Design an enzyme around this catalytic site. Structure first.
Site, PDB file in Angstrom:
ATOM      1  N   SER B 145       0.828  -1.201   0.000  1.00  0.00           N
ATOM      2  CA  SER B 145       0.000   0.000   0.000  1.00  0.00           C
ATOM      3  C   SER B 145       0.863   1.252   0.000  1.00  0.00           C
ATOM      4  O   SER B 145       0.460   2.297  -0.523  1.00  0.00           O
ATOM      5  CB  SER B 145      -0.941  -0.006   1.204  1.00  0.00           C
ATOM      6  OG  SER B 145      -1.920   1.012   1.092  1.00  0.00           O
ATOM      7  N   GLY B 146       2.061   1.165   0.580  1.00  0.00           N
ATOM      8  CA  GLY B 146       3.030   2.233   0.448  1.00  0.00           C
ATOM      9  C   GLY B 146       3.453   2.503  -0.974  1.00  0.00           C
ATOM     10  O   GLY B 146       3.942   3.600  -1.262  1.00  0.00           O
ATOM     11  N   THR B 150      -3.202  -0.359  -3.319  1.00  0.00           N
ATOM     12  CA  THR B 150      -4.361  -1.020  -2.710  1.00  0.00           C
ATOM     13  C   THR B 150      -5.574  -1.075  -3.635  1.00  0.00           C
ATOM     14  O   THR B 150      -6.435  -1.948  -3.481  1.00  0.00           O
ATOM     15  CB  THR B 150      -4.747  -0.320  -1.408  1.00  0.00           C
ATOM     16  OG1 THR B 150      -5.856  -1.006  -0.817  1.00  0.00           O
ATOM     17  CG2 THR B 150      -5.136   1.126  -1.673  1.00  0.00           C
ATOM     18  N   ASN B 185       8.557   5.459   3.218  1.00  0.00           N
ATOM     19  CA  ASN B 185       7.293   4.998   2.654  1.00  0.00           C
ATOM     20  C   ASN B 185       6.396   4.435   3.749  1.00  0.00           C
ATOM     21  O   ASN B 185       6.121   3.236   3.812  1.00  0.00           O
ATOM     22  CB  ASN B 185       7.527   3.974   1.544  1.00  0.00           C
ATOM     23  CG  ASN B 185       6.334   3.839   0.623  1.00  0.00           C
ATOM     24  OD1 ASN B 185       5.323   4.511   0.811  1.00  0.00           O
ATOM     25  ND2 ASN B 185       6.447   2.977  -0.382  1.00  0.00           N
ATOM     26  N   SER B 188       2.779   0.998   5.816  1.00  0.00           N
ATOM     27  CA  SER B 188       2.836  -0.209   5.008  1.00  0.00           C
ATOM     28  C   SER B 188       2.390  -1.404   5.834  1.00  0.00           C
ATOM     29  O   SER B 188       2.890  -1.621   6.942  1.00  0.00           O
ATOM     30  CB  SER B 188       4.252  -0.443   4.479  1.00  0.00           C
ATOM     31  OG  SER B 188       4.384  -1.750   3.956  1.00  0.00           O
ATOM     32  N   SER B 189       1.446  -2.168   5.298  1.00  0.00           N
ATOM     33  CA  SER B 189       1.119  -3.455   5.891  1.00  0.00           C
ATOM     34  C   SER B 189       2.260  -4.431   5.640  1.00  0.00           C
ATOM     35  O   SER B 189       2.428  -4.934   4.526  1.00  0.00           O
ATOM     36  CB  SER B 189      -0.184  -3.990   5.302  1.00  0.00           C
ATOM     37  OG  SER B 189      -0.090  -4.110   3.897  1.00  0.00           O
ATOM     38  N   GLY B 411       7.583  -5.319  -0.008  1.00  0.00           N
ATOM     39  CA  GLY B 411       8.446  -4.975  -1.115  1.00  0.00           C
ATOM     40  C   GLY B 411       9.911  -4.976  -0.735  1.00  0.00           C
ATOM     41  O   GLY B 411      10.273  -4.992   0.439  1.00  0.00           O
ATOM     42  N   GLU B 413      13.421  -3.784   0.221  1.00  0.00           N
ATOM     43  CA  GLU B 413      13.690  -2.699   1.151  1.00  0.00           C
ATOM     44  C   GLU B 413      15.159  -2.321   1.102  1.00  0.00           C
ATOM     45  O   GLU B 413      16.031  -3.153   1.374  1.00  0.00           O
ATOM     46  CB  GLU B 413      13.291  -3.090   2.571  1.00  0.00           C
ATOM     47  CG  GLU B 413      11.798  -3.218   2.738  1.00  0.00           C
ATOM     48  CD  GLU B 413      11.064  -2.030   2.168  1.00  0.00           C
ATOM     49  OE1 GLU B 413      11.296  -0.903   2.648  1.00  0.00           O
ATOM     50  OE2 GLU B 413      10.265  -2.223   1.229  1.00  0.00           O
TER      51      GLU B 413
END
Ligand SMILES: Nc1ncnc2c1ncn2[C@@H]1O[C@H](COP(=O)(O)OP(=O)(O)O)[C@@H](O)[C@H]1O
Ligand SMILES: [Mg+2]
Lengths: 369, 705
Positions: B145-146, B150, B185, B188-189, B411, B413
């Protein structure tokens, strides 16, 4: 801002040019483990250096790679260089001119190969080894007088007048600092204690550090502490015991003032420095007596200044003023002077850039210093 | 028409007057006329190769190609773009006819290179595969979502259901225990939630069950000072709905407790102050009795509430006595179980023998570690049980057996001051790329096999295996932490000393950075494909130590329905590393038993200006996401998917002529004289089945003239 790193056998001291205090100082011990490895997974370090090594002497053997101003077993002294540059002072040599230190005349081959080892692997930009005494002189701001540094590995005198390093009277002597410790071993065996191994041999210089004051009229003070129990002193090892040192307390440093105890048949330091005085002109003695400067280490023993004054004024004609300069900045005056010398802008042109070494061969240090 | 290494982006279109000696004179698209270094100057692909929906047909396949093509296509307000097997979208934010009803039932064939770039197409082709091979499919969503994603699968899932709305309703609540704001960012989930939708042999949706994978279990304690904890913690924090706080006995002050005080707890961008109403409402309407409803609060609070626990070092001894009876007692009431036996089971755990005498032993340090371990475990297992309940309110009883699953993963990192957590997450993210490389290699292997001449280098997966071994393979890196926590007197520096002893030079991927400009000094570095990583290992030994104390676990059974229910269902001192490795192997196994396809997301900028590119960001995400790595695979290899007829058609400039579009040397008349025009290397291309792959790059110059 180049660098300044002392070579002296006792305490390799590292710092930066201009700074008034060495950034890091540590004993020059090099250690190796002397027992098999028992608890798998230690990831043992194959060698140790400096106060890290001093930390765990328990299972360690100690090699001093620097004896009598001669750099022996070059592998470990290179190890000390490497540990210094990266861990203590923490900069790559690639971006810092470097200056070292060296006793008056030690051998010929020493510098001629040490410049190579520190100038070919560490790939330093530039370097210039400076004889100890002249550096000590600048450190105190007096450009005329006699230097007696007696850095732990070696003791020596120079006459320096009006800023001239008058060579021929340089009077070296191997009455090193460590050998006071070694003799103290033999004198302490008598009171019933025993210090056979190497670790305890390192401890004893520590126990020497506090409990050795040189006293005038050695005979009278000796009989004094013999008759009366006044100065019976105590101290403790990191073992639990407490040790009682009698007249050995002031029989330690007097090996300096006369070597008959250690055996060496070369007069005590006061007579040597008087000798080097009397081996110059009949006009330089006017001032030389007046600016006498101690230096290096092994002269932080209390009283030694005064005892020295007494011996010299007895020897010299009793018409001169022998007021000796013994600042308490000792044991570092080497390094202070080194930093100041590195700070001199005119000095920048002197030392050796890589080009000269590459195009000239190793002898450049001797040829140009 | 060339490319220039300009300062800011280094991959932008250029214009050479000429290039000389090492210094290219060129007028740049980025700015004005300048001079630049030759070696990194790249060459523009020809118009016929240029502006192709797939990023697999551009002769100089290099990174500048995919960069400028995305920049232009999104500049023209196009959003769907194909990049090898990967599909790329940017999903602008001012409304466009993006979800038009015309396409919804439209793309019912056109496997992947017969329709305009569009991912509803490939998902529907997956539907067709289901119809044919009757075998599971997997959606590979990169970015979180970052990354602005979404709003994509929330529509894609309805798309797939077209050929139901209960699926989303879980999201608002499960986010609260799973969204975590990071250094970069934020919001984030960080938990993986593989999501599968079941179809029977028929094709009408029967149910969709959801299982989370590889939740970040160490986020609970020792969070970074700069970052912030789970959103739920600060949801409960805000005084809004104070009656639940009255149930939960919390004082309403973030900094009171140990666990929270590490956090910032003041994030002006987004707080759950309003969101607590929505989360509570969903968490209710998802079929929760009030008893379980407030019990969830009870456990979530207690997990905080341990943070007040305080212990002292016993006299002339080693074990730990409990200090602060009142907060232990408030906790004990909160979980119902008695305080005295809880503190006792803390100070003297039971360890069995051939007959279970009440053995005993602890130390304060061990206790402070262990209670945190217990809290982390109870929270994680609580979360998974809530997943079970979400299954419960969505339960089905139809014959559902064949599912196409969407999985969301953290994602890649790379940013400042990265500890263990980043290493774990990056390893997880890249293993999926290992999976991708092996998969595309398999398919292209059989395809090139039909055109069999010779393969370059089997098992594209070796490129990643070279670092997979370093991270995991026994006595690699991850294993060293496992061993180091066990070994006595865990000290941080000795860890790095062992690593340097064991894998420097010996491992060709373990090296050291130098003077990382303003970010605090990392200790050791690794060369991944996506980006060289830099870490400092401070606190790692603390992070991974977590002894799952038994006695308290057995003590937990005689309390409220939840905790016994959670912990009743289920050893070499499990530490986050081992649990993590095992769970990742489980996940890859589940993907080992499936087939992949790839859906990506692209962020335009922080300023959130839709329709317009902003290069600083997108380059980093594209490099990180590994789409550039897939392009690397294609570039170094054959994969340039070319019709042999296509090549015979495009090559007439060397077959002296001008006119394209057929009616010159065709497929059957080539590879005889053609390369002899300008003396191009032989055997770089042939016709086996009149499908030919290429060492492309040699085909850019020959069509500029
Ligand atoms: N407390 C002390 N009193 C007197 N001498 C000491 C004391 N502590 C150390 N020393 C001596 O100082 C010596 C160091 O001198 P040296 O190494 O010759 O000079 P540098 O350290 O500048 O090279 C040590 O060998 C030690 O014997
Ligand atoms: Mg010394």
């Amino acid at each position: 801002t180049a660098l300044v790193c002392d070579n002296g056998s006792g305490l390799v001291k590292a710092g930066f040019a201009g700074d008034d205090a060495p950034r890091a100082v540590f004993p020059s011990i090099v250690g190796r483990p002397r027992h098999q490895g028992v608890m798998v997974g230690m990831g043992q370090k194959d060698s140790y250096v400096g106060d890290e090594a001093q930390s765990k002497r328990g299972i360690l053997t100690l090699k001093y790679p620097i004896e009598h101003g001669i750099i022996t077993n070059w592998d470990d002294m290179e190890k000390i260089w490497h540990h210094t540059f990266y861990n203590e002072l923490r900069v790559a040599p690639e971006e810092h001119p470097t200056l070292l230190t060296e006793a008056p005349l030690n051998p010929k081959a020493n510098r001629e190969k040490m410049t190579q080892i520190m100038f070919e692997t560490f790939n330093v930009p530039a370097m210039y080894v400076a004889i100890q005494a002249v550096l000590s002189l600048y450190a105190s701001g007096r450009t005329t007088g006699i230097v007696l540094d007696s850095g732990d590995g070696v003791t020596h005198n120079v006459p320096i007048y009006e800023g001239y390093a008058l060579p021929h009277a340089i009077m070296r002597l191997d009455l090193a600092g460590r050998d006071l410790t070694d003799y103290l071993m033999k004198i302490l065996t008598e009171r019933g204690y025993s210090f056979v191994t190497t670790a305890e041999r390192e401890i004893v210089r520590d126990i020497k550090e506090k409990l050795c004051y040189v006293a005038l009229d050695f005979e009278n003070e000796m009989a004094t502490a013999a008759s009366s129990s006044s100065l019976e002193k105590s101290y403790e090892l990191p073992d639990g015991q407490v040790i009682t040192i009698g007249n050995e307390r002031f029989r330690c440093p007097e090996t300096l003032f006369q070597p008959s105890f250690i055996g060496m048949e070369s007069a005590g330091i006061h007579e040597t420095t008087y000798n080097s005085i009397m081996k110059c002109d009949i006009d330089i003695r006017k001032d030389l007596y007046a600016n006498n400067v101690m230096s290096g280490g092994t002269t932080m023993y209390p009283g030694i200044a005064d005892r020295m004054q007494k011996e010299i004024t007895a020897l010299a004609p009793s018409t001169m003023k022998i007021k000796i300069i013994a600042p308490p900045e000792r044991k570092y005056s080497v390094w202070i002077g080194g930093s100041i010398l590195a700070s001199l802008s005119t000095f920048q042109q002197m030392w050796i850039t890589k080009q000269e070494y590459d195009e000239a061969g190793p002898s450049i240090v001797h040829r140009k210093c | 028409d060339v490319f220039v290494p300009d300062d800011k982006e280094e991959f932008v279109k250029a214009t050479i007057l000429s290039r000389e000696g090492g210094k290219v004179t060129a007028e740049t698209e980025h700015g004005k006329t300048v001079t630049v270094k030759e070696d990194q100057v790249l060459q523009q692909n020809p118009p016929k190769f240029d502006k192709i929906e797939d990023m697999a047909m551009l002769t100089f396949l290099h990174e500048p190609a995919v960069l400028y093509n995305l920049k232009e296509r999104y500049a023209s307000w196009m959003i769907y773009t194909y990049s090898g097997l990967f599909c790329v979208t940017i999903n602008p934010y001012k409304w466009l006819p993006v979800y038009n009803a015309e396409v919804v039932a439209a793309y019912r064939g056109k496997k992947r290179s017969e329709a305009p770039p569009h991912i509803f197409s490939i998902s529907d082709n997956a539907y067709q595969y289901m119809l044919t091979d009757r075998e599971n499919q997997s959606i590979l969503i990169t970015g979180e979502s970052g990354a602005g994603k979404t709003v994509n699968t929330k529509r894609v899932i309805q798309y797939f259901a077209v050929i139901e709305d209960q699926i989303i309703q879980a999201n608002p609540a499960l986010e609260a225990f799973g969204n975590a704001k990071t250094v970069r960012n934020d919001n984030s989930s960080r938990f993986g939630k593989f999501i599968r939708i079941h179809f029977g042999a028929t094709g009408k949706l029967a149910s969709a069950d959801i299982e989370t994978y590889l939740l970040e279990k160490s986020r609970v304690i020792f969070q970074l000072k700069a970052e912030r904890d789970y959103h739920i913690f600060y949801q409960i924090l805000s005084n809004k709905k104070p009656e639940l706080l009255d149930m939960l006995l919390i004082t309403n002050n973030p900094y009171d407790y140990a666990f929270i005080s590490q956090g910032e707890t003041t994030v002006a961008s987004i707080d759950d102050a309003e969101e607590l109403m929505a989360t509570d409402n969903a968490f209710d309407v998802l079929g929760f009795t009030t008893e379980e409803k407030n019990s969830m609060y009870k456990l979530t609070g207690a997990i905080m509430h341990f943070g007040n626990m305080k212990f002292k070092l016993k006299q002339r001894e080693e074990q730990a006595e409990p200090d602060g009876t009142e907060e232990a007692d408030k906790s004990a009431y909160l979980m119902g179980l008695n305080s005295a036996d809880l503190l006792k089971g803390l100070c003297h755990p039971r360890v069995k023998v051939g007959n279970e005498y009440v053995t005993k032993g602890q130390n304060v340090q061990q206790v402070v570690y262990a209670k945190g371990a217990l809290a982390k475990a109870v929270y994680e297992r609580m979360f998974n049980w809530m997943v079970t309940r979400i299954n419960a309110t969505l339960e089905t009883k139809q014959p559902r057996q064949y599912f196409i699953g969407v999985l969301d993963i953290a994602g890649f990192e790379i940013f400042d001051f990265n500890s263990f957590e980043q290493l774990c997450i990056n390893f997880t993210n890249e293993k999926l790329q290992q999976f991708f490389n092996h998969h595309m290699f398999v398919l292209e292997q059989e395809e090139y096999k039909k055109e069999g001449i010779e393969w370059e280098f089997i098992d594209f997966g070796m490129d990643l295996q070279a670092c997979i071994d370093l991270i995991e393979k026994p006595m690699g890196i991850m294993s060293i932490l496992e061993e180091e926590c066990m070994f006595p007197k865990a000290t941080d520096m000795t860890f790095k000393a062992k690593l340097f002893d064991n894998h420097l030079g010996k491992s060709s991927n373990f090296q050291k950075p130098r003077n990382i400009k303003g970010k605090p000094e990392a200790h050791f570095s690794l060369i991944h494909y996506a980006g060289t990583v830099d870490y400092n290992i401070i606190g790692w030994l603390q992070k991974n130590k977590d002894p799952l104390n038994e006695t308290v676990v057995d003590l937990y059974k005689k309390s409220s329905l939840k905790m016994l229910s959670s912990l009743f269902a289920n050893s070499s001192f499990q530490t986050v590393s081992a649990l993590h490795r095992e769970n990742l192997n489980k996940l890859m196994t589940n993907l080992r038993s499936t087939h992949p396809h790839f859906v990506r997301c692209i962020i335009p900028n922080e300023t959130k200006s839709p329709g317009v590119i902003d290069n600083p960001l997108v380059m980093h995400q594209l490099r990180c996401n590994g789409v550039l790595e897939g392009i690397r695979i294609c570039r170094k290899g054959f994969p340039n998917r070319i019709l042999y007829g296509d090549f015979r058609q495009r090559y007439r400039i060397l077959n002296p002529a001008a006119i394209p579009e057929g009616q010159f040397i065709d497929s059957r008349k080539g590879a005889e004289k053609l390369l002899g025009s300008l003396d191009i290397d032989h055997n770089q291309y042939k016709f086996g089945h009149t499908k030919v792959f290429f060492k492309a790059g040699l085909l850019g110059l020959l069509e500029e003239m």
